[PDB]
Amino acid sequence: SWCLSVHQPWASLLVRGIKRVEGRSWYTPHRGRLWIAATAKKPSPQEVSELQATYRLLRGKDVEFPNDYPSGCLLGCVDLIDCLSQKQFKEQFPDISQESDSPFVFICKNPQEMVVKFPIKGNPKIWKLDSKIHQGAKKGLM
Amino acid sequence: SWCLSVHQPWASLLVRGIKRVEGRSWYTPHRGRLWIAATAKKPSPQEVSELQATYRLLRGKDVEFPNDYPSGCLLGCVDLIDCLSQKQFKEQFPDISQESDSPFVFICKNPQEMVVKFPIKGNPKIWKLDSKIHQGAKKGLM
DNA sequence: GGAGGTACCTCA
DNA sequence: TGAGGTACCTCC
Numbered sequence A, B: 001s002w003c004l005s006v007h008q009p010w011a012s013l014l015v016r017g018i019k020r021v022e023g024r025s026w027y028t029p030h031r032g033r034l035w036i037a038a039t040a041k042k043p044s045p046q047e048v049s050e051l052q053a054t055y056r057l058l059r060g061k062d063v064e065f066p067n068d069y070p071s072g073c074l075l076g077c078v079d080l081i082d083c084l085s086q087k088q089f090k091e092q093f094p095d096i097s098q099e100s101d102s103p104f105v106f107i108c109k110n111p112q113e114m115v116v117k118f119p120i121k122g123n124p125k126i127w128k129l130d131s132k133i134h135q136g137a138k139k140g141l142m
Numbered sequence C: 001g002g003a004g005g006t007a008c009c010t011c012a
Numbered sequence D: 001t002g003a004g005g006t007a008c009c010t011c012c
Helices: A010-015 A045-059 A086-092 A131-140 B010-016 B045-059 B086-092 B131-140
Strands: A002-006 A021-024 A032-038 A073-085 A104-119 A126-128 B002-006 B021-024 B032-038 B073-085 B104-119 B126-128
Touching (some): A010 A032, A073 A086, A086 A104, B010 B045, B010 B073, B010 B104, B073 B086, B073 B131
Antiparallel strands (some): A021 A104, A073 A104, B032 B073, B073 B104
16 A cells, blocks of 8 residues: 655666666555555756666666656556665675665565556655555556 | 936935945946935845944944935935046045945935925936926925 | 756655 | 755856
């Protein structure tokens, strides 16, 4: 039921598995499925292309980006398998530890993207999806 | 017929005779009567009190400020008797030369403040008043 | 100028 | 967060 709002384009890169971690100033004990919502903040076409170029260098020339990075909607989910301090992140994930310098690093696995994305208004930190949109999101995930 | 738009509170201080010069980056050959209009930019009550404190120190304890500094209106007029370079300003007005460091300094005399001030939309530099507001302004000056 | 789009900032 | 007030910026 629990959701994290993330700015685009990083939001969609997370549910595509291209971005593998998300950094925050705070810790969460939450483990398991974590829904990902894009914030309302639209990214300029410039930062989308620059971030895409960067992730091409990190992941390979032919990585498949989403066609769009829609704002203000529920995108999909990840499994939040750990929430690591920066020190723990460097010890356990040396190959990607450069990808976040935040005090706490959310380690995400098993991303899933919704083919139909639903408009939504987010909140800070981990917040709870409303039942109706949560039910429709799980149905979409077939 | 010619007018200069000036930000408040400086605009009203000019037509009161409290501010004696106005600095600009450009020169004008205009001499004689120059109407003074306040721009639309409203001044914060903080810059009004700080500027009043400063001019109290420059002119004396009991100098009489206007009760209000209205924006976007025709305030009055001065006689523009010279337009001096900064070098000429220092040579000719050593007692007040510190009051403007602009490339050109408009030397104003015989200020008159209108009892009834008329709303107006200004322009850059010296611009020409419309004849209806000019006629009404001259009449107000009795 | 004056007008208004946009980025920035704050939020009993 | 999302919302919107405000300051800042540009202007065939």
